[PDB]
């Protein structure tokens, strides 16, 4: 997914903008917060801009699924659930410590190996 994800020169990122101090519209109209940051820092890495895709929560895994989207970074807990559909990377947000509780985790699907491991060596970086 990497290469066309570059060829393309664009990620696309679905979030639900309704989770402060995740993702939020600001008084500007703006999406903005914790995961927006995330977003842009692996467009950067990846070389891409950044297009969020905004969209209500329980859209985001049909999304992902139909190729909407690239990735989701939207306070996104890893359940095992969704582990059944999509495939999550290391956790980046810890809401209880120690590991504790829920941990929010960036949803690729199972094909798109190589752009999870890449995730996952930013996430590391970071």
Do not use: H, W
Not at 62 to 85: A, C, F, H, Q, Y
């Amino acid at each position: 997914a990497i290469d066309e994800i570059k060829s393309r020169g664009y990620l696309l990122v679905g979030l639900s903008a309704d989770f402060p101090p995740f993702e939020f519209v600001d008084e500007n109209g703006n999406i903005v917060g914790f995961d927006v940051d995330l977003a842009k820092e692996i467009a950067r890495r990846l070389g891409v801009e950044l297009k969020i895709v905004d969209m209500t929560f329980d859209g985001l895994i049909p999304s992902l699924l139909t190729k909407k989207i690239d990735v989701i970074i939207s306070g996104m807990t890893i359940t095992e659930e969704r582990k059944k559909v999509v495939a999550f990377s290391d956790p980046y947000f810890d809401a209880g410590g120690g590991g504790s509780g829920e941990q929010y985790g960036i949803a690729v699907r199972k094909e798109d190996t190589d752009l999870l491991e890449f995730i996952n060596s930013v996430l590391r970086e970071l």
